[PDB]
Amino acid sequence: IIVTQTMKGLDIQKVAGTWYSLAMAASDISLLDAQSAPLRVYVEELKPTPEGNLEILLQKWENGECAQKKIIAEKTKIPAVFKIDALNENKVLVLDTDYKKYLLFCMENSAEPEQSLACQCLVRTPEVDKEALEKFDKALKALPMHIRLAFNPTQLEGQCHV
Amino acid sequence: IIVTQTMKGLDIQKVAGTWYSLAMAASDISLLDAQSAPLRVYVEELKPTPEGNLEILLQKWENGECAQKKIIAEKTKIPAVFKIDALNENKVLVLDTDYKKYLLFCMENSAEPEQSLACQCLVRTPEVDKEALEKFDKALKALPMHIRLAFNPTQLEGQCHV
């Protein structure tokens, strides 16, 4: 319901390849509280499909091991919005990207936007990017976030951010 | 973490009574990551002693239960700085308080300050005090925090912030 930035004219062709989850924030602490939390997922690659859908390749900590996971995100009539059925979420919104440095996105469940919102700052390179983090924090300033995590370069490079 | 002009003239007797942990932040995500994390402690009461020490009464999730813990903070020559022997920390610093609404404090381990720093915003009622949170965030801007949690009234009223 709260209007945020959205990526007008998002071209997914241009988001393919490596990304690193630099920062994360969520409305409900439980979404991101513990390595085991349901929305603690680390984006490792984005893969647009021939049909214009988007595969999201993730790492996620489960039962003492770092697991590879893949979310299938279905295109919609809005370039920046995708439909999913994963992590108890049903939408992905791309807030902003410059393709070659950073990409900001949120996930939510349309049924319970207040209890399901989780957003990330992705960067292309495994460094703490000042521009990207500032843009992330600005983009979220009106959102009801109660947990925020920011990662260091060693964590960006390591499996499951260890 | 340093002794500021704000911290001068603290009267520890006046912090007696009931408090609630409204927000927490730490340098190392793993200090606060998960309910069971070592610095995930919820202050419920402060008990100053006649000789000027400070007992800190807390709730902490351990072995799948919400436990009560008491930490004795021993005075030093600086009124706002105390020695502790708990939580793999050895210092408590009171950054700021108005006695009747909010108190900001940090803990650290003087042998490894940067991987041990954890700070809290305490309030006198189980309500979200935006002004206290602003003071907290301003006080933390110079500190290398990587995790921040902010709690809601239901969490403040519950045991171990559930």
Pick the CATH number of A1-162 from 2.40.128.20, 3.40.50.1370, 3.40.50.1980, 2.60.120.200: 2.40.128.20
Calculate the dihedral angle through the C-alpha atoms of B29, B31, B34, B35, rounding to the nearest 10 degrees: -150
- Give residue numbers after which chain A breaks (C–N above 2.5 Å): none
Spatial separation of the C-alpha atoms in residues A132 and A96, rounded to whole Å: 10
Q: What is the DSSP string of A96-129?
A: EE-SSSEEEEEEE-TT-HHHH-EEEEEESSSS--
Q: How far from each other are the two terminal CA atoms of chain A, in whole angstroms?
A: 35
Can you list the alpha helix ranges (DSSP code H) found in B26-151? Answer: 113-116, 130-140
Spatial separation of the C-alpha atoms in residues A19 and A42, rounded to whole Å: 9
Spatial separation of the C-alpha atoms in residues A66 and B131, rounded to whole Å: 40
Which chain A residues are closer than 8 Å to B33 by Cβ? 33-35
Q: Is A152 an 8 Å CB contact of chain B?
A: yes
Domain ranges of chain A: 1-162
> Which helix (H) or strand (E) covers residue B30, if one does?
none
Q: Which experimental method was this entry solved with?
A: X-ray
Spatial separation of the C-alpha atoms in residues A61 and A80, rounded to whole Å: 28
Spatial separation of the C-alpha atoms in residues B94 and B107, rounded to whole Å: 9
Spatial separation of the C-alpha atoms in residues A152 and A20, rounded to whole Å: 11
Q: Could you tell me if B54 and B71 are in contact, meaning their C-beta atoms sit under 8 angstroms apart?
A: no
Nearest to B34 among A33, A146, A151 (CB): A33
> CA geometry: angle at A21 spanning B106 and A68, to 5°?
120
> Which helix (H) or strand (E) covers residue B156, if one does?
helix B153-157
Judged by CB atoms within 8 Å, which residues 20-59 of B form the interface with A? 29, 33-35
Measured between CA atoms, how close is B36 to chain A, in angstroms? 9
Q: Could you tell me if A91 and A76 are in contact, meaning their C-beta atoms sit under 8 angstroms apart?
A: no
Helix (H, G, I), strand (E, B) or coil at B54: strand
Cα distances (Å, whole numbers) of residue A83 to A78, A90, B4, B53: 11, 6, 51, 57
Which chain A residues are closer than 8 Å to B145 by Cβ? 150
Residue A21 β-bridge partners: A122
- Residue B127 DSSP symbol: S
Q: Could you tell me if B136 and B112 are in contact, meaning their C-beta atoms sit under 8 angstroms apart?
A: no
Spatial separation of the C-alpha atoms in residues A5 and A127, rounded to whole Å: 24
